[PDB]
Amino acid sequence: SDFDALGGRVTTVETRVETVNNSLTG
Amino acid sequence: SDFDALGGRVTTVETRVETVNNSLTG
C-alpha cells in the first residue's frame, strides 16, 4: 500500500544510525 | 492495518537517534 515511504524512512534511519555512530566514534 | 503502531515506533526511533546524537555530541 502506502508503507513504501515507511520502508524508505526505515532505510534512512538505518543509515543515519551508522553515520552517527561512526562520526561519534571518530 | 495494525502497522500504525509500527509507524509510531519508527517515529520514536527517528527522534531517539537524533536525541542520542545530540547528547553525545554535546
Curated annotation (Swiss-Prot), chains A, B:
Biological classification of the source: Bacteria, Thermotogati, Deinococcota, Deinococci, Deinococcales
Disruption-associated phenotype: Deletion causes substantial alterations in cell envelope structure, and a significant defect in resistance to solvent and shear stresses. Mutants shed exterior layers of the cellular envelope. Deletion mutants show a significant decrease of the UV resistance, especially under desiccation conditions. Deletions mutants show large disruptions in the OM, but the S-layer is unchanged compared to wild-type cells.
Function: Plays an important role in the structural organization and integrity of the cell envelope, bridging the outer membrane to the peptidoglyan layer. Is a highly abundant molecule in the D.radiodurans cell envelope but is not a fundamental component of the S-layer. Binds the carotenoid deinoxanthin, a strong protective antioxidant specific of this bacterium, and could be part of the first lane of defense against UV radiation, especially under desiccation. Appears to be a nonselective channel.
Location(s), subcellular: Cell envelope; Cell outer membrane
Additional comment: D.radiodurans possesses an atypical cell envelope comprising an inner membrane, a large periplasmic space with a thick peptidoglycan (PG) layer, and an outer membrane (OM) covered by a surface layer (S-layer).
Domain notes: The structure is characterized by a pore region with a massive beta-barrel organization which is embedded in the outer membrane and shows some protrusions into the S-layer, a stalk region consisting of a trimeric coiled coil, and a collar region at the base of the stalk.
Self-association and partners: Homotrimer. Part of a heterooligomeric complex resulting in the main assembly named S-layer deinoxanthin-binding complex (SDBC) which is composed of six different subunits, namely SlpA, DR_2310, DR_0505, DR_A0283, DR_A0282, and DR_A0281.
Protein name: Outer membrane protein SlpA
